[PDB]
Every structure is written in C-alpha cells, then in structure tokens.
C-alpha cells in the first residue's frame, strides 16, 4: 500500500472495548463468533463477529478488550447485522490471532 | 468519526513487529527499533511510553506499528513508523498489541 497522509490514517475510528456478549454463529459459512462489544457511553455496545474458533471461545471471550473500526456502514453476513470490524492477524498457520492491550483502558479510547 | 469505506480502510498499512532495541529518548519518549519481518525489515520509531514502560520491559514485545507513513526526522533520528497505543484513565499510552504470539510482519486485517 503506497505512503499515506496522518489525515488517512485518523479518519479510520479504531476504538478498544470490552466484549460482554459471545455466542456460536453456525449459521456462517466457516466456524465463527458473533459478539457485542461495550464501546463505552458515547459509542455504545456494537455488534460484531469473526473466524476465531480456534483459538477462542464465546465463554472466555466475556471481558476481552478487543480494537474494532467502528465508523464503517453496517455490513449484513448472511442474517447478520455486523456493525463493527474486529481486529486481529492470521498466526503462522492462518488462524486468527486478536488485537489487544496490553493492559487495561478506558472503554472507547482512539488508537493512535 | 464520519463514516468511511473498506476502501478508506485498506489504504492504512498496520503491521506487528518485535521490537529488538529500545533506549531512552530525553529530549519524555523511548526510541525504538522494531523488527516487521522479511519484506519490510527494521524500522525506527519513538514513544511517550516511559510511565508504564522501559527499554527492558519493551525488547522482545510485539507492537503494532503504521508502515506507510513518509519518514520524517526528529534532529538526527529518523523516525519511520507510528506505534500503536492508547491513552489510559490518566492519559498516559498503552501499547496496542496481540493476544498471542504472530509472524513479524503480519497485516491487521
């Protein structure tokens, strides 16, 4: 991807929260998670989901900060309303490795 | 922010790295070195990151870093790419990162 201006970069809203809700999503064409995520009280909770069977569950997701873009437009996945992109990486075998903190912050917080 | 598109998205380059030198940076900041893996090598960067970090703390920690940024010189040090962070309840940066180990150079998707 050619060079970028800080302006470029700014305008995507990437925000840390706290996932509080995770359940099965068998309904998508490859194993998935569907979660909502408290952004904090001016962002509020967010729906979500992403392939990350392998290396989470949806009862030990509860309480993980995670970064999601949280100013695309809603993305409809099959019967759901996603709201927000999940961040992660694929691991040296291609499963899904989640973006996090290193330690806790305030629910809401830009990165940058 | 405003709405934006995938598009919009895809045009920020973001990667994981290790950083595998890092000293302290008076002037309060640390420069770092950061290792983004083959095909984008070794990169500088420097952070307000001295309240919850040292240099012995940071080297051999994965940290996420813009790569498409033009470099630019803070008096003779090159800085070349932004680490990731977010201010905590007082204001002061905590490094984004990852959940569990990932190959240098993996892009956030």
Do not use: W
């Amino acid at each position: 991807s050619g060079e970028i201006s800080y302006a470029d970069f700014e305008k995507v809203d990437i925000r840390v929260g706290t996932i509080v809700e995770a359940v099965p999503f068998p309904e998508a064409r490859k194993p998935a998670i569907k979660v909502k995520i408290d952004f904090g009280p001016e962002i509020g909770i967010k729906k979500s989901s992403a392939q990350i069977t392998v290396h989470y569950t949806p009862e030990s997701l509860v309480g993980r900060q995670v970064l999601g873009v949280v100013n695309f437009p809603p993305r409809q996945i099959g019967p759901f309303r996603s709201e927000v992109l999940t961040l992660g990486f694929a691991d040296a075998n291609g499963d899904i490795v989640l973006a996090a903190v290193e330690r806790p912050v305030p629910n809401g917080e830009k990165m940058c």
